[PDB]
Structures are given as C-alpha cells and as structure tokens.
C-alpha cells in the first residue's frame, strides 16, 4: 500500500504457521503482553481481529542472535558511571541482572544524580535501588516500541487501545499525487523512508552528471558512472501508485547514503503518509456526528487528498475443441462506435478512455455447432443474415472500474514469448484512475482517530479565522475524551506553533518554562518542522508557553491565544461562533478503504453450481448474504412474505427467479414462489 506498509510486513513476528500453533489452540496467555517483550517485541502493534496477540512487530533496536532468540541493546554502567560500551542481552540473561530506565538523570561525565533510581527486575517487578547496584540502563526511551509505533507523536498521551489502531492504520495509508512531510514529526520518518527501499539512495559519492524524469546519472570520484532508473507510474501489489521523482538537480554535490530521489509517500527522504490539514475541534451542524469527518472543498480543488489507483486487466486466447480463440477487432453484432477505441488487432489504444461495459480486448471463440433455435432460424431467414459460429468472449471493463489506458503488454506464442500449454495470445491492459477524495472515504490520524468523510462543503461554507482563511477539516469534539487519545490535541497545538513560527522572550533572561528547551528551538520560522520523540520531546509546560509565542500573520495579528483556541466565523450565517474554538494543524492520512471499491449491488447475475444460490463477492458480482441472524429479525417482525421471497424467488428457485424477472418487466404481479432447489439437494444428499 505504502512504503511503511512494506517495511512493517518484513518485521512481523507471527506465532501462526506449520510447527507453530493454530488460531483455535491459542488461549489467553499466548496473546497478552509479556514482560520479556521489552525492547524486543512491541506491546502496541498487533491486529484488532481474531489474530490479536498472535501477530506483532519487532522492536526497533532489537536483533536476532545465532540461536534464534531475540537480543536487545543496553548501556553498560561500570560503577554508577554510564559507559558508551554496549552489549546485547537475551531475555533470560537480563533477568539475572538489573536495568535502569533510559530517562534517569546522568552527570555530564557519566554518573547518576540520585542514589536510588528506577529499576527493572526479573518477572516484571520494579523497585528503587541504590546506585551501587545498577548494572545496565536502557539505550533509548523509545526502546520498547516498534517502527510504526515510534512514529506516533505524543504516544504517551494516548491509551493503548486507540494507539494500537493508530499504528495499524498507518500501514493502510494511500500514496497521494504528491506528498508532504508532516509538520509534527518524531524523527523516525527519515530512517523509515530510507530503510524502506522504495526511495533511491546514492551508492557512492559524487556529482549529478545528468537528471531527467526518467533517470539520474551519478559521476563518482574515481570516474565510474552509476545510473539510477526511476520507477514511473508502476502498479503495486495493491493497485496503489509507486511513482518516483528526482530530488536533486543537475550538478548537485551528493554524498554516499543520501536520498537523491524518493518514492510514493515520501517528501525529501521522509515518510510522508499524509497531509498537514488546518483542523477545527467542534461540532458543526451534525455532519460530523459519531466520528464522521467534514472536509473543505479546497482538498478537492487542489488535489490535496487525491490519489492514483492502477488496475491490471488480463485475458488469454486458448486452443479449444471447436478451434481456437482468436483476438480480433471483429466482434459479432457490434457497431463501429463501440469498436472505435481499438486498434487493428482488437486491443484498446494507449491513452484511450474506458468506462464500465466497454471493450478492452476483443476476443471471439468458436461456439459449439448445436442446433440453433427454430425461432431464431426463422428470424435468420427473414433478414437473410447467416449466423457466425463465433461467440463474443471479449474482455470488458468490470462494473465500477474506469480511467485512462496507460499501457499494453502483449505476449504471443507467435513472437516466441514462452506461454503455458494451450495459450496463444495473452493481453495485459493497464488502467489508472485519478480518484479525488469523496464522501465515504476513510480518513485517519496517527492517534487512532479514524472515520469516514460525511460531507465536503464548498470552500465558503467552512468556518474561517479572522483573516479569512477557511479550515480544511472539522473534527467533532465529542469523540475525543472518550478515546483517551488526547495526543491528537497536543499535535494540534504544536502543529499550529509550527505553522506560524515562534520566538521565546530572551529579554530579562531565558524564561523558566523554556529552560529545558534546547537552544535551537527558541526561535522558529513559519512552516517549521520539529521532532517529538516518543517518551521524550515536548512537555505540556513548553507547549502552553509556545502557544504564547505564536508569531502574527502577514497582517500583523496573532490568530490563536495562549489556550490554543481562536475565534471562528460561521461561513453560513456569517455571525461569529459564540465561543473560542481550538484551531491548529493536524496530520491526516488517506486510508485504503475507499467507497469506489466498497460500493456494490446486483439485480440478477451468476449462480452457484450446486446449491443454485447466488454467488458471493464484488469480484463475482454476487448478492449479499441473508444469514441465520438476519432471518431471526424477519421472523421477529413477522414478515413471512418478505422472508419467504428472500429465500425462494430471490435465491435458488430455478424457475421462480426467471418468472419474477418476467413478471417485473411486463409490469404484472409477482408469482407464487416454488421449491428451493437447495432443499432438493439436501433430500438427495440424505438419500
């Protein structure tokens, strides 16, 4: 789906599979968080479903030792003095020792501050222990988490329930047309992007000899030239758009290990899983009731949340008993208006537009020489048109799909292309779509705050600040304190400070709240980028203070207060909202649960070969399942005729569903249902 999606997948740790356990065999002990998991396997990242606890991700700093156990790094303390010497410990080995927490205060030389410090001990027990007994201490505060987990800003402000979903959903993010790096980071966004392999890293140092949209050439120092080819508009495993673009310009000095060209969901070598949106924390005319989301039409007019989705359509020509399937531009009883977008072969032309029902690859097969209908024999004598022995077996566009044909791949047995036994010509047409964001598309933040798009208002309807700028996204207030994930609130505060810029007051000295604040953050530009590492980073006192530091806009006016709130104007009634609303910037990702895929319906269609019931799935154009649970609801209501119809003429009544289709199109009354063919099957299976 995205670069991170792949990266996560390679670091999964399942207990499933041969040699391991089954899903039904696993009790409640296997699944929950064990003490030894610290720094080895994440306690947060795990599926929501029936696989929960049986699947996890490897902690960031961990590694595997030659015996198949999991080791993890710790700093070695000689005698109250931290040493840069690091040794990897296994699970049971650590239990024999005693480990201090990472954030414990350390002297500039290496010594501890207090005699008694926080201490980790065997069996998950913790106590205060004198500094003389300290063996090791953690490498990092963020040592226990996984890769996707450490990418959640203010993690320690969100409950494990939503923070879990916050990690799982990132993996579901969709690559947009172009991607922006988050205003609020955690620092992990860089190393994740590089180690993904879906960016282009320079092997050896040198200078960009030539750059094009096609490839980048690098002139090394010894003289040799390596050329890096750009993946352009390729279809991923999940129909997303892997598209790479050159970062460097021609003539730039580039060193080894530097990102010279990034891919989808990447901005300057950083994981760009979403966009920075101007949020507003408030109910608004109910359109965001129960976790729904309201969007500015600006995100539709500026493609801010627009994505490209590529599909691979396939069809082949085989050797049959009545001859052989041939791919031709001549299809029985079709006008030249339908064939208009094909070439001479029968293939669609690259760049052509395709809607559902249209033809991609014209194929016809010799139909069996069975006696044609005496009523169709008569119909062929009047108009004197002799019947062809070739039936239409063309590759048409599936319901819902549409877009521009962006390439053809043809494999012919004729052109020595090696095919499976029986196949002559195989055609692959690739169609991409430029899906703008719409109603029902699932959006989310990094804090387990999900939901679908309820409504996208015109840009003017949007609640706007004093200077006229309309907000992008309107989240509902109700669904915040319940989820305990108020890290989305802190992200909004720091997110605003990062957009406006700030400057701590240095007159009369450096203030007491911004005393722990490193020098480099005492002055910030508009649209600045910052890091809030998990279990480190910003604290509530500095955030509050920074809200006072907010630099005024172009008109010389500050827009938000020290509370973080601001005054909005209702774009509909014009009047100002009575109370200050919390405004700022938030990072919102486009998840891969789009209505354009999710929507589906069916009148009649294909049917089961045995039970004679409808088929199942959107891929087979099947109808919904009216299960045992749903038949109780009907029964409870006392809607016998509705229930009967659903299981008879709507289902597997061979003669009924046909005579229902006829009764409808003729405008008569629905006939009386017969016997469910499935019941006939049962009485034969019993026999």
């Amino acid at each position: 789906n995205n670069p991170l999606s792949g990266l996560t997948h390679k670091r999964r740790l399942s207990a499933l599979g041969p040699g391991g356990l089954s899903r039904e065999r696993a009790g409640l002990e296997v699944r929950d968080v064990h003490p030894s998991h610290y720094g080895r396997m994440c306690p947060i990242e795990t599926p929501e479903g029936p696989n929960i606890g049986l699947i996890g991700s490897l902690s960031v700093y961990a590694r595997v030792n030659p015996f198949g156990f999991i080791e993890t790094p710790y700093r070695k303390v000689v005698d109250g003095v931290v040493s840069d010497e690091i040794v990897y410990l296994t699970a049971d080995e650590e239990d024999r020792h005693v480990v201090a927490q990472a954030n414990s205060p350390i002297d500039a030389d290496g010594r501890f501050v207090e005699p008694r410090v926080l201490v980790r001990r065997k069996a998950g027990e913790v106590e205060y222990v004198p500094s003389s007994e300290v063996d090791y201490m953690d490498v990092s505060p963020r040592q226990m988490v996984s890769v996707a987990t450490a990418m959640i800003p203010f993690l320690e402000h969100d409950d494990a329930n939503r923070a879990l979903m916050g990690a799982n959903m990132q993996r579901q993010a969709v690559p947009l047309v172009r991607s922006e790096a988050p205003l609020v980071g955690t620092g992990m966004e860089l190393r994740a992007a590089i180690d993904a392999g879906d960016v282009v890293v320079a092997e050896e140092s040198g200078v960009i000899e030539e750059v094009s949209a096609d490839y980048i050439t690098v002139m090394h120092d010894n003289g040799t030239r390596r050329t890096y080819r750009m993946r352009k508009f390729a279809r991923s495993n999940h129909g997303t758009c892997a598209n790479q673009c050159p970062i460097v310009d021609a003539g730039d000095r580039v060193e080894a290990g530097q990102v010279i060209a990034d891919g989808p969901c990447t901005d300057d070598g950083e994981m760009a899983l979403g966009k920075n949106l101007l949020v507003a924390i408030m109910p608004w005319e109910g359109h965001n009731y129960e976790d729904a989301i309201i969007l500015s039409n600006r995100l539709v007019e500026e493609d801010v949340l627009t994505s490209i989705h590529i599909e691979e359509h396939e069809i082949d020509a085989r050797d049959t008993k009545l001859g052989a399937e041939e791919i031709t531009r001549d299809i029985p009883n079709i006008s030249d208006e339908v064939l208009a977008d094909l070439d001479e072969r029968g293939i669609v032309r690259i760049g052509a537009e395709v809607r559902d029902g249209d033809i991609l690859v014209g194929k016809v097969t010799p139909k069996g020489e069975t006696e044609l209908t005496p009523e169709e024999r008569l119909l062929r004598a009047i108009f004197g048109e002799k019947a062809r022995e070739v039936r239409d077996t063309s590759l048409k566009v599936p319901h819902g799909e549409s877009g521009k044909v962006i390439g053809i791949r043809v494999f012919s047995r004729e052109d020595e292309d090696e095919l499976p036994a029986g196949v002559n010509e195989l055609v692959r047409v690739y169609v991409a779509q430029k899906r703008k964001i719409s109603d029902g598309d699932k959006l989310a933040g990094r804090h387990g705050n999900k939901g679908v798009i309820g409504k996208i208002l015109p840009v003017e309807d949007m609640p706007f600040l004093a200077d006229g700028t309309p907000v992008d996204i309107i989240l509902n207030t109700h669904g915040v304190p319940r989820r305990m994930n108020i890290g989305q609130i802190l992200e909004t505060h720091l997110g605003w400070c990062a957009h406006s810029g700030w400057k701590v007051d240095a007159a009369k000295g450096v203030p007491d709240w911004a005393a722990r604040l490193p020098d480099e953050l005492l002055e910030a530009q508009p649209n600045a980028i910052v890091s809030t590492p998990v279990f480190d980073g910003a604290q509530e006192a500095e955030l509050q203070g920074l809200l006072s530091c907010t630099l005024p806009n172009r008109d010389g006016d500050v827009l938000v207060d020290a509370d973080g709130k601001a005054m909005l104007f209702d774009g509909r009634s014009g009047e100002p909202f009575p109370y200050p609303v919390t405004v700022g910037y938030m990072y919102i990702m486009k998840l891969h649960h789009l209505v354009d895929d999710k929507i589906h319906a069916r009148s009649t269609g294909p049917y089961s070969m045995i039970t004679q019931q409808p088929l199942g799935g959107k891929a087979q154009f099947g109808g919904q399942r009216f299960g045992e649970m749903e038949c109780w609801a009907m029964q409870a209501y006392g809607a016998a005729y509705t229930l009967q119809e659903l299981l008879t003429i709507k289902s597997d009544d061979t003669v009924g569903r046909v005579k229902v289709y006829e009764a409808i199109v003729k405008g008569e009354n629905i006939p009386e249902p017969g016997i469910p063919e499935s019941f006939k099957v049962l009485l034969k299976e019993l026999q």
């Binding site: 790094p73 840069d84 190393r191 290990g257 990102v259 480099e520 980028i529 890091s531 590492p533």
Partner: peptide, 23 residues
C-alpha cells in the same frame, strides 16, 4: 537536529541528548 547522518532536512528536536547508537 535529530539524525545528522545522511544529508537530510533539519528537523529540530525537543530531547535529552541521545548518543547511544543510531537505529
């Protein structure tokens, strides 16, 4: 800065100085 190793954009960090080891 946070990761001053590859040649990356400068992302300033609220932090206690982390020099044990790179990821």
């Amino acid at each position: 800065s946070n990761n001053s190793v590859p040649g990356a954009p400068n992302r300033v960090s609220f932090a206690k100085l982390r020099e044990p080891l790179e990821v």
